C-alpha cells in the first residue's frame, strides 16, 4: 500500500568544514572510510565507516571443525545444521573383526563404519568432510573410531573334551558361522554438544534419569554415536552324557559306541566319564559406541574497518584464519555499523556455503558464528539478503531509496527497525514534490533518530548541485538540504556527492575529482552540519 510523504521544507546548512587531515584516496579507487552512494546494498549504516572483506587462497588444510553452538555448548562456533549418520554393516568380514575383538583374540581388530554419503554431503549446505586422519584400522584410514564394544548378553564359550588327568571339561572360543545370520547395527547418528546416553534402568525414582556412555569433543569436530545390535552367529559346543561300564578277569577296560568321547583319569583309569560336544547355533549381539571426526573448508578472511572520529580517520584490519594471499573480494557482504568502529557483518566468500557472522570493534574480533547459504538461493543478492535477515536479523537498510517519477522507499528500510519481510514491510513511501531529481541518482541512507538521511539526490543539469534527503521514519514528511555553497568550486561548476555518511547530526561528504585529461585525483572530503529542528 502506498503512503504519501510531503516535502515539509529545506534544512539550511549551518556549517561547513573541509576535511583535510586525512589519507589520500584515489577517485579511481574509492574512499577508505566513506561508503559510496552506490553501496547502500551493503549497509545498515550508522556513520562514516567503511568495511571490505577479502578472501584468502585456501586448500584442504584450512578447516573448520564441526563445533555447533547450542544451549549445551555455548562456546561452539557453528550455527549451521549437520546430522551425519551411518551403520556398522554385518557380514563375514566385519563379524570376524568384532568377534576377534570382543573375545580378546586380537585387540587391534575393529569393524569399518559405513557412513551414509548423503548425510555427509549435507545437501552442500555446507558440504562436510570426514577426517580420515583421525583413526586407522590397520592400513585403512577412517574418520570413525569404535570406542566401546558392549555385548548385549554375556559372551558364550564352547566346552571342550574333559581333561585326561582331571576329567574337567575345558573351554574355547565359539566359531563364527560363515553362513549364519548377519544383522546390521541400528542407525548411529552423531551428536556434538552432549554425551550419548542410555535410560537409567531404575530411573524412577533413583537419579540420574540417563547415563552418559561416551562424550564428543565439539572443539575438535568430534561427534559421538551409538550403533546398537550388530549381530552375527556362532557355533557353541556343550558337553553331555554320563559314564559306567562292566571288562574283567585279566583286564579292566571296555569298548563300544559311535561319535562319543570317553576319557579315563590318567592317575585312575577306573575314574571315568563320557559324553559328547553338542554344537548349537547362537546369536551374538553387541552395542558399539563410536566417535566421528568431521569438518568443512573455511577460507580465511581479512576485513578492513575504517571510520572517521575525533577528527582523524581510524584505520583497522582483522584476519580470521591463516590468511596468506588474496584470492578475491568476498562474494557477498553486509555490514551494520555504529559509526565508531563497531560492526556486525555477514560475509560469504562464495555464492553459497560457509559464511561468517562477525562482530567487530576496531581491529578486535568480538565473535564469529558460522552459517551456510543454501545452494537454493542461487547466489542471488536479493535472496541472500532475505535469508540473512531471517537467520541473523541483518538487512542492508541503507539501500532502498530510489527515484523513478518521484523518490520512493519501502517501509522496511525507511523505518529501519525490523530486518525481516512481513505484512506492510513492502508498503511504498512516495515523497511528493521530489520529481525534479534525476532517475540515475544513487542513495545510501542512514536511519538515525527521527530521520533516514540518504545521500545523493542529483540533477540532469550540472547547474543544480546535489541534495541530501531527510525522511521522517514515521513517514510524516521529508526535507531536503541544499548544499550548493558547500559543494561549489568553479563559478559555474560544483562538486558532486559520491560518498556519503551521516552521524550525530553531521553529514560527511566525499567528492570524486579528476584532471582536465581524466586522471584520478584525491577525493575531496567535507563535513556539513544541517540546521535541524
**For residues 285 and 406, which CB has a smaller minimum distance to Ca ion in the complex?**
406
411: left (phi over 0), alpha (psi -120 to 50) or beta: alpha
- Does the footprint of its own copies cover residue 369 (CB under 8 A)? no
Q: Which of 6, 12, 23, 531 binds its own copies (CB under 8 A)?
A: 23
Beta bridge partners of 296: 64
Distance of CA 396 to the CA centre of its chain: 22
- For residue 439, the partner it binds in its own copies, Ca ion, none, with Cβ less than 5 to 8 A by kind, is Ca ion
- For residue 247, the partner it binds in Ca ion, its own copies, none, with Cβ less than 5 to 8 A by kind, is none
Residues 304, 53: Cα–Cα separation, whole Å: 7
- For residue 106, the partner it binds in its own copies, Ca ion, none, with Cβ less than 5 to 8 A by kind, is its own copies
Residues 313-352 as x/- pattern, contact with its own copies by CB under 8 A: --x-x-x-xxxx----------------------------
- Does the footprint of Ca ion cover residue 91 (CB under 5 A)? no
Which grid coordinates are listed for 265? 583319569
- For residue 10, the partner it binds in its own copies, Ca ion, none, with Cβ less than 5 to 8 A by kind, is none
Q: How far is the CB of 471 from Ca ion (least distance, A)?
A: 16
**For residues 40 and 299, which CB has a smaller minimum distance to Ca ion in the complex?**
40
Residues 445, 400: Cα–Cα separation, whole Å: 8
- Does the footprint of Ca ion cover residue 407 (CB under 5 A)? no
Q: Which helix (H) or strand (E) holds 92?
A: helix 92-102
- For residue 323, the partner it binds in its own copies, Ca ion, none, with Cβ less than 5 to 8 A by kind, is its own copies
Residues whose CB falls within 8 Å of the CB of residue 181, separated by 6 or more in sequence, listed in order? 231, 232, 233, 283
Q: Which of 76, 120, 135, 453 binds its own copies (CB under 8 A)?
A: 135
Q: How far is the CB of 65 from its own copies (least distance, A)?
A: 10
- Does the footprint of Ca ion cover residue 503 (CB under 5 A)? no
User: Which of 38-46, 131-139, 188-196, 281-289 is the region at the interface with its own copies (rule: CB under 8 A)?
Assistant: 131-139
Beta-carbon neighbour count of residue 406 at 10 Å?
16
Cβ-contact 510, 31 below 8 angstroms:
yes
Q: How far is the CB of 100 from its own copies (least distance, A)?
A: 8
**For residues 286 and 431, which CB has a smaller minimum distance to Ca ion in the complex?**
431
Q: Which of 163, 241, 312, 367 binds its own copies (CB under 8 A)?
A: 312
**What 8-state DSSP symbol labels residue 471?**
E
Closest C-alpha among 107, 19, 39 to residue 329: 39
Residue 451 DSSP SS3: strand
The radius of gyration computed from the CA coordinates of the chain, to the nearest angstrom, equals 38
- Does the footprint of its own copies cover residue 132 (CB under 8 A)? no
Beta-carbon neighbour count of residue 58 at 10 Å?
18
Q: How far is the CB of 93 from its own copies (least distance, A)?
A: 12
Residue nearest Ca ion (C-beta atom): 439
Q: How many CA atoms lie within 13 A of 35 on its CB side?
A: 37
Per-residue 3-state assignment (H helix, E strand, C coil) for 479-496: EEEECHHHHECCCCCECC
Residues 374, 353: Cα–Cα separation, whole Å: 7
- Does the footprint of its own copies cover residue 367 (CB under 8 A)? no
Q: How far is the CB of 58 from its own copies (least distance, A)?
A: 12
Residue 441 DSSP SS3: coil
Query: Among residue numbers 416 through 445, which ones bind Ca ion (CB under 5 A)?
Result: 439
**What 8-state DSSP symbol labels residue 119?**
H
Cβ-contact 340, 49 below 8 angstroms:
yes
**For residues 402 and 482, which CB has a smaller minimum distance to Ca ion in the complex?**
402
Distance of CA 187 to the CA centre of its chain: 24
- For residue 403, the partner it binds in Ca ion, its own copies, none, with Cβ less than 5 to 8 A by kind, is Ca ion
**For residues 22 and 285, which CB has a smaller minimum distance to its own copies in the complex?**
22
Residues 367-406 as x/- pattern, contact with Ca ion by CB under 5 A: -----------------------------------xx---
Q: Which of 33, 43, 134, 335 binds its own copies (CB under 8 A)?
A: 134
- Does the footprint of its own copies cover residue 371 (CB under 8 A)? no
- For residue 321, the partner it binds in Ca ion, its own copies, none, with Cβ less than 5 to 8 A by kind, is its own copies
CA distances from 220 to 52, 136, 225, 300, 475 (A): 30, 17, 15, 18, 52
Named by the residue before each, gaps in the chain exceeding 2.5 A from C to N are 246
Query: Among residue numbers 287 through 306, which ones bind its own copies (CB under 8 A)?
Result: 300
Query: Among residue numbers 75 through 114, which ones bind its own copies (CB under 8 A)?
Result: 100, 106-110
Write phi, then psi, for 479 (nearest 5 degrees): -135, 160
Q: Contact residues for its own copies (CB under 8 A)?
A: 21, 23-24, 100, 106-110, 133-139, 300, 312, 315, 317, 319, 321-324, 365
Q: Contact residues for Ca ion (CB under 5 A)?
A: 402-403, 439
Amino acid at each position: 500500500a502506498n503512503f504519501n510523504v510531503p516535502k515539509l521544507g529545506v534544512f539550511p546548512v549551518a556549517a561547513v568544514f573541509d576535511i583535510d587531515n586525512v589519507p589520500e584516496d584515489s577517485s579511481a579507487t574509492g574512499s577508505r572510510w566513506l561508503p559510496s552512494i552506490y553501496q547502500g546494498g551493503n549497509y545498515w549504516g550508522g556513520g562514516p565507516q567503511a568495511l571490505h572483506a577479502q578472501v584468502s587462497n585456501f586448500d584442504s588444510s584450512n578447516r573448520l571443525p564441526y563445533n555447533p553452538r547450542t544451549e549445551n555448548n555455548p562456546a561452539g562456533n557453528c550455527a549451521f545444521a549437520f546430522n551425519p549418520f551411518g551403520q556398522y554393516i554385518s557380514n563375514i568380514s566385519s563379524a570376524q573383526s568384532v568377534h576377534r575383538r570382543i573375545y580378546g583374540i586380537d585387540l587391534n581388530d575393529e569393524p569399518l563404519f559405513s557412513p551414509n554419503a548423503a548425510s555427509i554431503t549435507n545437501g552442500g549446505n555446507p558440504t562436510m568432510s570426514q577426517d580420515t586422519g583421525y583413526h586407522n584400522i590397520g592400513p585403512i584410514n577412517t574418520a570413525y573410531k569404535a570406542e566401546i564394544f558392549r555385548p548385549v548378553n554375556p559372551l558364550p564359550m564352547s566346552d571342550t573334551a574333559p581333561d585326561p588327568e582331571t576329567l574337567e571339561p575345558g573351554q574355547t572360543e565359539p566359531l563364527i558361522k560363515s553362513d549364519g545370520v548377519y544383522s546390521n547395527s541400528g542407525i548411529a547418528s552423531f551428536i556434538f554438544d552432549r554425551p550419548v546416553t542410555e535410560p537409567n534402568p531404575n530411573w524412577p525414582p533413583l537419579p540420574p534419569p540417563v547415563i552418559p556412555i561416551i562424550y564428543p569433543t565439539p572443539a575438535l569436530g568430534i561427534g559421538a554415536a551409538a550403533a546398537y545390535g550388530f549381530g552375527y552367529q556362532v557355533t557353541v559346543y556343550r558337553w553331555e552324557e554320563i559314564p559306567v561300564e562292566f571288562l574283567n578277569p585279566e583286564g579292566s577296560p571296555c569298548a563300544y559306541e559311535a561319535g562319543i568321547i570317553l576319557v579315563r583319569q590318567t592317575s585312575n583309569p577306573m575314574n571315568a566319564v563320557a559324553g559328547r560336544l553338542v554344537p548349537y547355533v547362537e546369536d551374538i549381539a553387541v552395542d558399539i559406541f563410536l566417535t566421528g571426526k568431521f569438518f568443512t573448508l573455511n577460507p580465511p578472511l581479512r576485513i578492513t574497518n575504517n571510520y572517521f572520529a575525533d577528527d582523524e580517520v581510524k584505520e583497522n584490519t582483522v584476519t580470521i584464519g591463516n590468511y596468506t594471499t588474496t584470492l578475491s573480494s568476498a562474494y557477498y557482504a553486509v555490514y551494520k555499523t555504529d559509526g565508531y568502529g563497531g560492526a556486525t557483518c555477514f560475509i560469504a566468500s562464495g555464492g553459497a556455503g560457509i559464511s561468517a557472522l562477525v562482530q567487530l570493534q576496531d581491529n578486535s574480533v568480538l565473535d564469529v558464528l558460522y552459517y551456510s547459504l543454501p545452494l537454493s538461493l542461487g547466489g542471488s543478492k536479493a535472496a541472500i539478503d532475505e535469508w540473512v535477515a531471517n537467520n541473523c536479523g541483518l538487512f542492508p537498510m541503507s539501500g532502498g531509496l530510489d527515484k523513478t517519477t518521484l523518490l520512493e522507499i519501502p517501509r522496511r528500510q525507511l523505518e529501519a527497525i525490523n530486518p525481516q519481510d512481513g505484512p506492510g514491510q513492502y508498503d511504498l513511501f512516495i515523497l511528493d514534490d521530489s520529481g525534479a531529481y534525476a532517475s540515475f541518482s544513487s542513495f545510501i541512507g542512514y536511519p538515525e533518530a527521527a530521520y533516514y538521511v540518504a545521500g545523493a539526490a542529483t540533477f540532469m543539469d550540472v547547474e543544480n548541485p546535489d541534495e541530501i534527503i531527510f525522511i521522517l521514519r514515521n513517514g510524516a514528511g521529508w526535507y531536503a538540504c541544499e548544499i550548493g555553497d558547500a559543494l561549489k568550486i568553479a563559478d559555474d561548476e560544483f562538486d558532486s556527492v559520491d560518498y556519503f555518511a551521516y552521524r550525530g547530526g553531521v553529514m560527511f561528504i566525499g567528492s570524486a575529482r579528476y584532471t582536465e585529461g581524466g586522471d584520478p585525483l584525491p577525493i575531496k572530503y567535507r563535513a556539513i552540519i544541517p540546521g535541524l529542528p
